[PDB]
From a paper:
[name] is the catalytic subunit responsible for the majority of K63-Ub specific [name] activity in the cytoplasm and in the nucleus as part of two distinct macromolecular assemblies characterized by the presence of either of the MPN− pseudo [name] proteins [name] or Abraxas. The Abraxas complex (ARISC) functions in DNA repair and breast cancer suppression, while the [name] isopeptidase complex (BRISC) promotes interferon dependent responses by deubiquitinating and stabilizing the type I interferon receptor, IFNAR1. [name] consists of a functional metalloprotease JAMM/MPN+ domain followed by a predicted coiled coil region implicated in protein-protein interactions. [name] and Abraxas are required for the catalytic function of [name] in both complexes, and enable association of two additional shared subunits (BRCC45 and MERIT40) to each holoenzyme.
Optimization of the [name] construct boundaries by deletion of poorly conserved C-terminal residues 290 to 471 ([name]ΔC) yielded crystals in complex with full length [name] (residues 1-253) that diffracted to 2.55 Å resolution. We solved the [name]–[name]ΔC crystal structure using the seleno-methionine-SAD method (See Methods for seleno-methionine protein production and crystallographic details). Following manual rebuilding and refinement, two highly interdigitated [name]–[name]ΔC heterodimers were apparent in the asymmetric unit, arranged in the suspected super dimer configuration. The final model displayed good crystallographic and geometric statistics (Rwork/Rfree = 0.189/0.240; see Table 1 for data collection and refinement statistics). The structure of each protomer of [name] and [name] consisted of a canonical MPN domain (residues 1–165 in [name] comprising an eight strand β-sheet flanked by three α-helices and residues 1–180 in [name] comprising a seven strand β-sheet flanked by three α-helices), followed by two non-canonical helices α4 and α5 within the predicted coiled coil regions. [name] and [name]ΔC protomers heterodimerized through a large buried surface area (SA) of 8112 Å2. The MPN domains of each associated in a pseudo two-fold manner centered on helices α1, resulting in a unified β-sheet and “fused” MPN+–MPN− superstructure (buried SA = 2902 Å2). Non-canonical helices α4 and α5 of [name] interacted with helices α4 and α5 of [name] in the form of a coiled coil helical bundle (CCHB). Ab initio modeling and comparison of the calculated scattering curves for the heterodimer and the four possible super dimers with the experimental data using CRYSOL was most consistent with the two-fold symmetric super dimer configuration centered on [name] helix α5 that buried 3093 Å2 of surface area. Contacts were predominantly hydrophobic in nature involving reciprocal patches composed by Leu198, Ile201, Ala205 and Ile212 side chains on opposing [name] protomers.
Residue numbers in the entry:
A (entry chain C): 6 to 54, 65 to 147, 151 to 251
B (entry chain A): 4 to 250
C (entry chain B): 3 to 42, 53 to 74, 78 to 185, 188 to 197, 204 to 217, 221 to 272
D (entry chain D): 5 to 42, 55 to 74, 77 to 163, 165 to 185, 188 to 196, 201 to 215, 218 to 271
Amino acid sequence: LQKVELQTDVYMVCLQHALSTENFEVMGLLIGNFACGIAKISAVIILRRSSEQLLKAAAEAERLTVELNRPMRVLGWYHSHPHITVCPSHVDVRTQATYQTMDHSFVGLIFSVFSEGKESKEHEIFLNCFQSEATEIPLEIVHTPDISDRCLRTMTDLSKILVQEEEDMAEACKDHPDVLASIHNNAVRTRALIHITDIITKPLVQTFEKRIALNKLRATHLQRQLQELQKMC
Amino acid sequence: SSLQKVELQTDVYMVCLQHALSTENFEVMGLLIGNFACGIAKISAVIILRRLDKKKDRVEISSEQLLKAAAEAERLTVELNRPMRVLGWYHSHPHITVCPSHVDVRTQATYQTMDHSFVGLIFSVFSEGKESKEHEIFLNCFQSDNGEATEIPLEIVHTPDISDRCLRTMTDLSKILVQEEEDMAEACKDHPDVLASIHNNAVRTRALIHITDIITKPLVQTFEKRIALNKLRATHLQRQLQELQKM
Amino acid sequence: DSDLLVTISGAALSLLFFENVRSVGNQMGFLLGEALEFIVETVKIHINVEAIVTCPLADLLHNHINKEKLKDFVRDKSKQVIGWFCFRRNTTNLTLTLKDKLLHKQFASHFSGVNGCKEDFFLTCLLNASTSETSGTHKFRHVFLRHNKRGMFEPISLKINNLGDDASRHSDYKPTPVRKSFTKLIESLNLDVAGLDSAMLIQKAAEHHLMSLIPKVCESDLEVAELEKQVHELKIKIATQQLAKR
Amino acid sequence: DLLVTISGAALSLLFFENVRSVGNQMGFLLGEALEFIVVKIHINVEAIVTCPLADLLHTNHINKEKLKDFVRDKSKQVIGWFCFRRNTTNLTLTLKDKLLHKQFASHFSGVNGCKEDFFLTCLLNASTSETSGTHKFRHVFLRHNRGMFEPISLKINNLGDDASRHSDYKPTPVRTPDSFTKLIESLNLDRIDGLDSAMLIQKAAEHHLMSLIPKVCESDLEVAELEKQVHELKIKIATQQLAK
Ligand SMILES: [Zn+2]
């Protein structure tokens, strides 16, 4: 494995996933194609927090191979370091290591986030591309003209996962005989849902819609220029 | 007229202890009412106070609270046909030693410029060995000497019951807690954002239920079961009373 | 033998201590409560102490327990008995005495087969009180134990449920346990249903109920206090007589 | 004091536009400011838009006419501007920056727009190690207080912590419904009923979010197609003019 080419729209998904929580490490798998030393990453899977997870990620790559008509497979993994350095921990190197025994040229990506200065008030986000001690691999974030249909849907899947995590917990105390407990659990569950809608779902809705809106602003602007330039011919 | 000994009634003891057990995360505080005999502070009444500070060592009773406490004492004086006065204060040490802190000594010393025989009680709660499973609670009765705390001899005097006023004091705690919650929720009433109002209601309902579950319900159970188990002992003693008269 | 946790409220514990510090000498009595099971796949046991009652040990002996006398005292409340307690004064020692163990075994056996759940986790609560040299500092120690299957007495974790932490915080959701009066109050007021603001309505109803109980607690306290006084005097009157005849 | 807030969504989109950018990049910050008594002010950037600086100049002087033509009605929402530079790990304000912040701040300020004291300049850079195995992204929000710029704190609202926690209760603000507020009212909702409201909102949001994915794709293709056409046409007539 010589280098990695990570698409901007995938990069955006991973960053967005990293910025979802400040108090936990987040994780996901990378999908793409491996040619002559370089790994072109063009897809991404958001994971819960495995055997059943690998299956759904492997299934995705299979479905992408058919739909895009190009070889898609799980090329690597990524996970966030909130309040940490990009430097892969001992566990980061070990997890990356076991993956390489299963697959050479298997790349690991670390997204360090939520690191601000005391009085500086400057933020820093690092992206570390590594394999396994941790050895750095050359990385190049490659331009895309748009956000892929699949990358868009992946962003919305985090919203679904979080809500499903909450429904499963609420289900495990469904018919509590104590009225106080029952009222408590419902209040807890209500706060959790509105917390997901406010922090994750709504911001995603607003981002999608305003991108569409602002695209049209720029679009109409461009065609004003296209007419003014077409005059010269 | 020097403080020679404190006699603390067992039912007042129960109120303070119960108050201290309400939370292991914050210190609680209240005032003690009774009468000062020949060198003896006899403590037979208690007032549970509202604490606004979350400061770990900053436990201060306000001037407004002292006055209201004095009013209560004056009422007890009339109600029980007996001299009642504010004789001292108490607070809790969750997860720390019972020994008075620097702030505790400095605060007690101020009270003594107001009243030379003012009593200080500290209830230590929520300490236990991870291995033995054994729990310890200390009760320290102290005054402030030349910058240092010194022990005041303490006796917890037997009471045949839990007095009406001690029972009423216990019931005040949840009321106070609920009122604190109400005040906080009050500051954000009528929120224009639907998501935020739903959130706030969820928060308020959980906090209120929390108080009812941890505090109010148990106290209801404790009162009711005392009544029942007293009657059980009551009927037991009566059956025994017939047999002994036969002797 | 499956994870075990004892739980109690500040209200209940304060009543226990109250009853202890009231007593003239050492004191004994029973623990009343309920055992709950949770699945986490492993099963944990919560044994919650809801209330306590004192009893003169002599009213049950012969140092062998008189079962008929015990049945006679407990009387229908035996289903609620989940353990017993022993309070000792002027000692810091919190070790089970041989007599204590014999009483635990007897009590455990009795309520085991009858109604008081399994013999594995019948409880012995051991409490004591001591004071410093000036008596300015009073120390109160307590611990729960049980008789495990291997014939050993092992201490059990105690959780005093409070506003800062309680046993139900295994996530924030309170899990439903394995199936098998405050609620009677809510039901009588039809409060177990609701956009009424049920939390506030339940709390207020609790407050009102609490207020009507105060005179009842007082009334019963005086009643049992007078009877204790009358019984103690006769016992002394009878006791002195046997002295004279000896 | 003052505080800038933003979601992971919005922030991720800004970083996305920066990285896919051919050369250096500039644009405007959209959002809204709120005041909270306790008086603290939260400036929330809701979205960004990129714009060629060379499409707004006459020299270093900004053409306030061409600026209005671009923003076009959405000037109201403008609360700042951002500049993205490459490789330079430097995160300091240059002279041209301050001049642009002053110009922009004056243009969008006033009764109709945002407050001039609250206009933000956002600087962003992207560096890379020699091996190019580690990428460093640095950014900061700034404002003009006296006469010396000061960095303002940034809180990225997330599941762990958000600007609203300063208690658990959401404090009401002092004093134009977005698309989400529209969806809410669409449900005509009116506590245990608080749960039913929450679940319905969750489902509505999920369904609405999914119907946007196809719309977002088609907009990205339209704007990306027009970009290509304009870029080539410029080059076409430029090579022609250079010949004659
Ligand atoms: Zn203290």
